[PDB]
Design a binder for these strands. Structure first.
Ligand code: NA
Ligand code: NA
Length: 327
DNA sequence: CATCTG
DNA sequence: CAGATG
């Protein structure tokens, strides 16, 4: 956790590069387990020879540990840091919709900057185009105070559309966090579930509302159960307009709500711990369900849950307010 | 994973 | 359809 940090950290830049610049999924995948194991490793790795010992830890890595151990630097790392090429990728990649794959192509066409992009908006797609157009805003963290305002909006319009809707705004927001990245809303309806063969209007209808009243400004991808978008807090009495926000709405069959609701809410650490416990308590949990685990090795059959409470119950645990869901 | 592109 | 992105 701090005893072998830089090591795990160099590994990480190394790995990241591989997969972002080079295409070395192979190698890339390698730095990773690597970082992962040294990470759990309980001692002060004094040498490469010491790491090699570890599994995942090959001769090359040990090569890299020794040098970095030997000098507070890595040549490769250092050479990688300057390299304009590697920089452009790692950069453009910051635009929504611009991945690495596209990172390469653009650079390879000589687009390597914000301006580059604008100049060539044509080579970008709707998503990439919005991505670039709200470059800044998208980079901006979300203050709780805004979050509550938005939530108030989402919930009011959904209500309006059907008293039967059940929205939940998950994430750290839910966990209490002072700020957030993006607005994540979990959506269901009675009239929608497991067997219940579709009803796409279920998701559409709302999208429209939020768009009616101008909350949602753009579509990233609107599918039949997942809409990826952009929303905005109405600018009050003009002088202070809000930033443009990344909002994501997803339809869920009522018979599956709280499982997800739990889940999306995190934290990741909480999930695992909660997941492992389930397992003890004779069960299994995942994003959609919680099932009675048999002895033969495995077994299923989705237990029926009416709230986040039913779940906890199942695994015989302390109902935890979203707050303490930390770890 | 579900949507998108081309 | 493969392949990318989030
Ligand atoms: Na090894
Ligand atoms: Na991106």
């Amino acid at each position: 956790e701090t005893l072998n940090g830089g090591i795990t950290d160099m590994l990480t830049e190394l790995a990241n590069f591989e997969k972002n610049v080079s295409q070395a999924i192979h190698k890339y995948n390698a730095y990773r387990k690597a970082a992962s194991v040294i990470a759990k490793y309980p001692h002060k790795i004094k040498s490469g020879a010491e790491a090699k010992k570890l599994p995942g830890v090959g001769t090359k890595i040990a090569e890299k540990i020794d040098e970095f151990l030997a000098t507070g630097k890595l040549r490769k790392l250092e050479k990688i840091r300057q390299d304009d090429t590697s920089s452009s990728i790692n950069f453009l990649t910051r635009v929504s919709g611009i991945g690495p794959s596209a990172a390469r192509k653009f650079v390879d066409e000589g687009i390597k900057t914000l301006e580059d992009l604008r100049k060539n908006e044509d080579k970008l797609n709707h998503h990439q185009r919005i991505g670039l157009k709200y470059f800044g805003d998208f980079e901006k963290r979300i203050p709780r105070e805004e979050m509550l305002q938005m939530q108030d909006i989402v919930l009011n319009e959904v209500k309006k559309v059907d008293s039967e809707y059940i929205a939940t705004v998950c994430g750290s927001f839910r966990r209490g966090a002072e700020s957030s990245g993006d607005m994540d809303v979990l959506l269901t309806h009675p009239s929608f579930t497991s067997e219940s063969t579709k009803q796409p209007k279920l998701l559409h209808q709302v999208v429209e509302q939020l768009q009616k009243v101008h909350f949602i400004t753009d579509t990233l991808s609107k599918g039949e159960t997942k809409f990826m978008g952009v929303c905005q807090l109405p600018s009050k009495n003009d002088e202070k307009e809000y930033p443009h926000r990344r909002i994501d709405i997803r339809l869920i069959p009522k018979d599956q709500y709280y499982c997800g609701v739990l889940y999306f809410t995190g934290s990741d650490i909480f999930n695992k711990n909660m997941r492992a416990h389930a397992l003890e308590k004779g069960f299994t949990i995942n994003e959609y369900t919680i099932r009675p685990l048999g002895v033969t090795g495995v077994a299923g059959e989705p237990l029926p849950v009416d709230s986040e409470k039913d779940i906890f119950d199942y695994i015989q645990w302390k109902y935890r307010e979203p707050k303490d869901r930390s770890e």
